[PDB]
Ligand binder design. Structure first.
Ligand SMILES: O=P(O)(O)OP(=O)(O)OP(=O)(O)OC[C@H]1O[C@@H](n2cnc3c(O)ncnc32)[C@H](O)[C@@H]1O
Ligand SMILES: O=P(O)(O)OP(=O)(O)OP(=O)(O)OC[C@H]1O[C@@H](n2cnc3c(O)ncnc32)[C@H](O)[C@@H]1O
Ligand SMILES: [Ca+2]
Ligand SMILES: [Ca+2]
Ligand code: NA
Ligand code: NA
Ligand code: NA
Ligand code: NA
Ligand code: NA
Lengths: 193, 197
């Protein structure tokens, strides 16, 4: 039994069944009454550990967490670890991507490079001194208009060159095969076996 | 021109890190030379403690920083001393006091139950608040001896037998240890990450 230490349904959709396929019994932290951890970390790695640790503390189960975000080159890597609250704590996925959009409206078509980052952590117990920490990243280009209805977050404005479409235009299987998250997950599963 | 602070006060670690970082092309300065005091290690993992030490140095000096958090995990002791390796014998701890304590602790542990592993995490931070530090790790299995042997290295090396070599970590040359240790492995990964960064 392993707790999935996220409240993000888009993350759950991209993780839970692949983890199950692998052979784990996955429980969403909300089912177990785990509230949101304080994300006080300055890096994806530290925040992923904090969220996994918070869930492992509450439940006494091993935990997997995901800290991820979008880094845009012209913005010096923003919104980065502040991706979820980019437009404030009114923030929704649509409000965040539209702010990003508005922010980049005068950025030339050839300067819109970006990269998604993902750190996945597996903690055997809350105080595991050697958690499995796996990361992935995924380069793309920020579009000027959203396209596609799949995925979540900034997916409609993230053009994926290798696919010739945005992340939201991919099927879930396609996106799982190549994303920052799918790359990290492959490394995590390798490490687990 | 541009310096990188080595965020450790452990001379044994400096001896094992500085020369390859210099060969790579980094201008390395030990944090003590810049007057940096030891950070408070409040982390529960090697990775968190390596990040905190790198960040403290980076903040104090305004230079990129590399830190190492490492320790010895003994199976029969449930992984102790672990992240508490440096302070194992307490507030007066020295390498010899720490290894002798561990010795004494393991006195009645049978020969087939003395397995252990060194762990190393190295971190590189461009700035104190770098959201994506380079984080590399290495581990190295061995067996705890009953008596110290060898004078090389530092820390618990005299009591860490390495089955592949048929001698303890302290009986290895500097070159032999760097080729196979938890730290040699992590450092080459870090150099690879730095180049490809
Ligand atoms: O902390 P948890 O509960 O896991 O949920 P969260 O959504 O608050 O998670 P983060 O702090 O890790 O927030 C990261 C964000 O990065 C964005 N993001 C992460 N992965 C994404 C993906 O695959 N596609 C689009 N956006 C993604 C996401 O929409 C948020 O803006
Ligand atoms: O924190 P810094 O300033 O780097 O110095 P420190 O010596 O306090 O560093 P740690 O908290 O990382 O302590 C780790 C320890 O693990 C031991 N250790 C680490 N690497 C070792 C090695 O290669 N051989 C023997 N012992 C080692 C070391 O002697 C300490 O007991
Ligand atoms: Ca969050
Ligand atoms: Ca220390
Ligand atoms: Na979002
Ligand atoms: Na989201
Ligand atoms: Na220690
Ligand atoms: Na030492
Ligand atoms: Na070494």
């Amino acid at each position: 039994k392993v707790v999935l230490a996220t409240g993000n349904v888009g993350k759950v959709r991209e993780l839970a069944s692949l983890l199950s396929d692998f052979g784990l019994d996955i429980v969403a932290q909300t089912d177990l009454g785990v509230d949101s951890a304080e994300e006080t970390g300055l890096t994806f790695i530290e925040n992923a550990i904090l969220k996994a640790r918070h869930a492992a503390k509450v439940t006494a189960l091993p935990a997997i967490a995901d800290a991820s975000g979008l880094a845009v080159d012209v913005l010096g890597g923003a919104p980065g670890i502040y991706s979820a609250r980019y437009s404030g704590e009114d923030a929704t996925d649509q409000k965040n991507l539209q702010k990003l959009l508005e922010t980049m409206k005068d950025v030339p078509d050839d300067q819109r490079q970006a990269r998604f980052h993902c750190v996945l952590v597996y903690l055997r117990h809350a105080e595991d001194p050697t958690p499995l920490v796996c990361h992935g990243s995924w380069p793309g280009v920020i579009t000027r208009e959203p396209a596609g209805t799949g995925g979540f977050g900034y997916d409609p404005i993230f053009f994926v060159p290798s696919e010739g479409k945005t992340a939201a235009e991919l099927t879930r299987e396609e996106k799982s095969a190549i994303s920052h998250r799918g790359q990290a997950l492959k490394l995590l599963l390798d490490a687990l076996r």
